[PDB]
Tab-separated table of C-alpha atoms and ligand atoms in Angstrom:
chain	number	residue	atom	x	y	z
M	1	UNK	CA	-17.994	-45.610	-67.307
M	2	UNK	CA	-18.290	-49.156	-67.473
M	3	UNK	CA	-15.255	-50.813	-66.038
M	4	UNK	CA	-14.232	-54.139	-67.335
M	5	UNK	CA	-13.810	-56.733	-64.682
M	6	UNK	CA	-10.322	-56.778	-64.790
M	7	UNK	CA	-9.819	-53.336	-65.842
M	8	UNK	CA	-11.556	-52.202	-62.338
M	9	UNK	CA	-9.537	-55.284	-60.393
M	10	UNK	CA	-6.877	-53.499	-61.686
M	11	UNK	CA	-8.045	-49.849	-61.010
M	12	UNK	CA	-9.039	-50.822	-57.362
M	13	UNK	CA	-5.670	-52.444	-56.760
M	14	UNK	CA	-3.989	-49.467	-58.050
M	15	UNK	CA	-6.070	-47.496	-55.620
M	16	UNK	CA	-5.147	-49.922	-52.058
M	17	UNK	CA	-7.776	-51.874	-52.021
M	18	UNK	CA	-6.866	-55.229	-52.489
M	19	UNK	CA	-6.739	-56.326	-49.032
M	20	UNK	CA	-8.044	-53.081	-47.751
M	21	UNK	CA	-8.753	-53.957	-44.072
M	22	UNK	CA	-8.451	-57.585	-45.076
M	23	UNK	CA	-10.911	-57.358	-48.003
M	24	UNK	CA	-8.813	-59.321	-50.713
M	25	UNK	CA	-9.520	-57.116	-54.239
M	26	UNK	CA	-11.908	-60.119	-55.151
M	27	UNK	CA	-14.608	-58.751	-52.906
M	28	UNK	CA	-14.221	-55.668	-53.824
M	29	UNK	CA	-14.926	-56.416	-57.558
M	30	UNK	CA	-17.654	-58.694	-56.500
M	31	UNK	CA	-19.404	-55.851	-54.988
M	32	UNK	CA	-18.824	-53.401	-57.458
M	33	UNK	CA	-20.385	-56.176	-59.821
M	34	UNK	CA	-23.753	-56.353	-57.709
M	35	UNK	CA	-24.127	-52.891	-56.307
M	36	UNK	CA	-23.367	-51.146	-59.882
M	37	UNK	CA	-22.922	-54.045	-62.478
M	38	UNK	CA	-19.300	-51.778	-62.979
M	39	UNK	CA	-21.166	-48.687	-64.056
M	40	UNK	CA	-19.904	-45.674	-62.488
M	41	UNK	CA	-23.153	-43.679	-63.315
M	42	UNK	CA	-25.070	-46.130	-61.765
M	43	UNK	CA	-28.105	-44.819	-59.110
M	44	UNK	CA	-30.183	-46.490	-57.154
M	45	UNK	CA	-32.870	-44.417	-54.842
M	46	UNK	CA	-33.216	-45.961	-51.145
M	47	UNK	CA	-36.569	-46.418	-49.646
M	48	UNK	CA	-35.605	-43.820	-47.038
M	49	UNK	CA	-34.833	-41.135	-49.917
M	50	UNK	CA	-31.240	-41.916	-49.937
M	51	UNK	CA	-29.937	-42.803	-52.955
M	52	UNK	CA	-26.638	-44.662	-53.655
M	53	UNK	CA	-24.412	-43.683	-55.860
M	54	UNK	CA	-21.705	-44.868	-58.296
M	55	UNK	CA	-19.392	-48.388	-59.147
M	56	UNK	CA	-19.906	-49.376	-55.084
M	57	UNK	CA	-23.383	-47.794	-54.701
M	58	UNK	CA	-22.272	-45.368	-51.634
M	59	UNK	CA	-25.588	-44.164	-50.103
M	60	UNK	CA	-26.049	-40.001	-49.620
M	61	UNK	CA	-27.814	-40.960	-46.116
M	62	UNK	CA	-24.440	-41.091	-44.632
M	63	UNK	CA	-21.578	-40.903	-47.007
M	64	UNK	CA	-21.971	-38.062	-49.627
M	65	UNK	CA	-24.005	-35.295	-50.175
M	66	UNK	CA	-26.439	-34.992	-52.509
M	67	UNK	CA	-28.563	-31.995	-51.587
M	68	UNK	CA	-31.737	-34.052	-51.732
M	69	UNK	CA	-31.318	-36.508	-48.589
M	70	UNK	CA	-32.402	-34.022	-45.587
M	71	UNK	CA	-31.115	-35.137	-42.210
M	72	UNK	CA	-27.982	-36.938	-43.856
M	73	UNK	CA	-24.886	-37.096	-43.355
M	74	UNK	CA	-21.890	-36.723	-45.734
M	75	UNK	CA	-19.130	-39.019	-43.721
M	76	UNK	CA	-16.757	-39.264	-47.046
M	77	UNK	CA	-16.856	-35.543	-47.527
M	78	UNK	CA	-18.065	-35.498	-51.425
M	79	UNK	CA	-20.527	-34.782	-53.502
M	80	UNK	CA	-22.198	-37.410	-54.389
M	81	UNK	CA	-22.095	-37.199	-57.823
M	82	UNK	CA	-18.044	-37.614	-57.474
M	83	UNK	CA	-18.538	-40.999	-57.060
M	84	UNK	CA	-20.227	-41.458	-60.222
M	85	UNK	CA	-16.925	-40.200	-62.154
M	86	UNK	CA	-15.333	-42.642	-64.317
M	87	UNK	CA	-12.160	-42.162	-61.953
M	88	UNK	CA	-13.061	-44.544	-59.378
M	89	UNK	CA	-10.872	-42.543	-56.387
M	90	UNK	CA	-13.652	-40.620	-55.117
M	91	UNK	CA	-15.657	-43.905	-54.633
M	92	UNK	CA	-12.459	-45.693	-53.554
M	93	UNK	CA	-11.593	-43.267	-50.528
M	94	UNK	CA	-15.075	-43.443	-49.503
M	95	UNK	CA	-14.910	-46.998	-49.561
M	96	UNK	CA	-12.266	-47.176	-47.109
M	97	UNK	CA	-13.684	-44.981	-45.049
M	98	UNK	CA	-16.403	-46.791	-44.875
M	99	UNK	CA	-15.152	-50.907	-44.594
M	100	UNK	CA	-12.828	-48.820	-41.836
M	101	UNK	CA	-16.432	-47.965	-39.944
M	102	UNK	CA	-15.864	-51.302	-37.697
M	103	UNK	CA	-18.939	-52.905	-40.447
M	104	UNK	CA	-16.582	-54.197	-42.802
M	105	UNK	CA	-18.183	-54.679	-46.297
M	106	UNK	CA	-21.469	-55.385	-44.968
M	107	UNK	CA	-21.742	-51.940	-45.746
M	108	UNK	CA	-22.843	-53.067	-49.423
M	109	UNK	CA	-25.909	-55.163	-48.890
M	110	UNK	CA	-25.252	-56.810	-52.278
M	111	UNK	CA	-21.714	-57.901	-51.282
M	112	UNK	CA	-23.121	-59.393	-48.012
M	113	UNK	CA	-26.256	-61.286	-49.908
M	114	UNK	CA	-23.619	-61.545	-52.975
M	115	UNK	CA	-20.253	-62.027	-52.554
M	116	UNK	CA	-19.380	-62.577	-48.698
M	117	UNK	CA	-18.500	-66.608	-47.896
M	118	UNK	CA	-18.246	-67.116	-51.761
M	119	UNK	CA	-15.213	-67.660	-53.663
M	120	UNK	CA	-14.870	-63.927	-54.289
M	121	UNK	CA	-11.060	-64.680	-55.463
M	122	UNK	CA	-13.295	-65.863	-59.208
M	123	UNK	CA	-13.199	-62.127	-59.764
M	124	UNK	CA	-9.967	-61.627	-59.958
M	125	UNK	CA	-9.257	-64.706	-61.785
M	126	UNK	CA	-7.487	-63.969	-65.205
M	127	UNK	CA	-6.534	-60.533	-64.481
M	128	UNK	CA	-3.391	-58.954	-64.724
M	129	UNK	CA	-2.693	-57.440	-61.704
I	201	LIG	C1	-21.980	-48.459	-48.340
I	201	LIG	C2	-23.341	-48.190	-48.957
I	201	LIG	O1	-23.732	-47.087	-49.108
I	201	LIG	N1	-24.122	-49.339	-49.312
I	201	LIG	C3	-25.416	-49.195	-49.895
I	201	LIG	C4	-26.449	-49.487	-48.825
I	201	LIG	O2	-26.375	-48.471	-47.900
I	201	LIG	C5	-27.835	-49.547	-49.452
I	201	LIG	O3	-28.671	-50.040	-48.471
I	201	LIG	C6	-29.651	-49.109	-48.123
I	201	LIG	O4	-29.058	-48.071	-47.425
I	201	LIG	C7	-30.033	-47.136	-47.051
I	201	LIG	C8	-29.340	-45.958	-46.388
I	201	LIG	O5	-28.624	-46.384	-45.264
I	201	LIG	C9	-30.969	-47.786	-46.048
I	201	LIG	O6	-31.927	-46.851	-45.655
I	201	LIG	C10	-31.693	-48.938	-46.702
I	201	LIG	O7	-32.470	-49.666	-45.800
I	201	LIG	C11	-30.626	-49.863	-47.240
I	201	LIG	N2	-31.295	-50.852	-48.032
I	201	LIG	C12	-31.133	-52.239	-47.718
I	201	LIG	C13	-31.856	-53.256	-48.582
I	201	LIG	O8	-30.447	-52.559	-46.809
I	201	LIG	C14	-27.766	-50.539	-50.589
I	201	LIG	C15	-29.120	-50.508	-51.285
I	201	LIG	O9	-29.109	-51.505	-52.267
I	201	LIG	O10	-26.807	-50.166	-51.500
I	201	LIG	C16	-25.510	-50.188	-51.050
I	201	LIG	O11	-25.162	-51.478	-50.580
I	202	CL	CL1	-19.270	-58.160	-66.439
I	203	CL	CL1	-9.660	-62.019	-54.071
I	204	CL	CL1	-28.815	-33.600	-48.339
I	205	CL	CL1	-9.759	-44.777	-61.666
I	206	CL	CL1	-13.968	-56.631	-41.343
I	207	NA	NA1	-26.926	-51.239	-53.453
I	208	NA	NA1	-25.822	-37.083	-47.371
């Protein structure tokens, strides 16, 4: 799925994110924007083998399991292809566990090079929430 802006403001809020470990929901939807461009199906391979994996890109070197990352680990518990679901709560309880992980969202390398010290509140603006 492709999540509207708002639509996956709204989804993430629903799910506890907005201010998740002091992450107001405007940097979550900022990284969702850059690590997936909203698209739950969305892959990306790593050049360690890894590949991330869904709306917030969640990498099978230490979050899910994908069967194809040897030497991994699979800290959220999942399959990585349940983060690619159209229901974002797999990839939302991963998420927390890992901004939780003492790294915040630097975790997402496109929210750090993306979204941190901007105005990330611009992508909630407009949104029903
Ligand atoms: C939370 C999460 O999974 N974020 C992804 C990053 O982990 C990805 O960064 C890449 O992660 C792999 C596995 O740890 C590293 O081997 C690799 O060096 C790292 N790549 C960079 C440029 O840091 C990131 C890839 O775009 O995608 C999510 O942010
Ligand atoms: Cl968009
Ligand atoms: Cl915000
Ligand atoms: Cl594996
Ligand atoms: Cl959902
Ligand atoms: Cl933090
Ligand atoms: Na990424
Ligand atoms: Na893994």
């Amino acid at each position: 799925k492709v999540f509207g802006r708002c639509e996956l403001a709204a989804a993430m809020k629903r799910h506890g994110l907005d201010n998740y470990r002091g992450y107001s929901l405007g940097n979550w939807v900022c990284a969702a924007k850059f690590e997936s461009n909203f698209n739950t199906q969305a892959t990306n391979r790593n050049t360690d083998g890894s590949t991330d994996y869904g709306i917030l890109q969640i990498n099978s070197r230490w979050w899910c399991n994908d069967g194809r990352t040897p030497g991994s680990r699979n800290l959220c518990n999942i399959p990585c292809s349940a983060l690619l679901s159209s229901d974002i709560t797999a990839s939302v309880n991963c998420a927390k566990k890992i901004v939780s992980d003492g790294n915040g969202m630097n975790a997402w390398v496109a929210w750090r090079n993306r979204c941190k010290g901007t105005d990330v509140q611009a992508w909630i603006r407009g949104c029903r929430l």
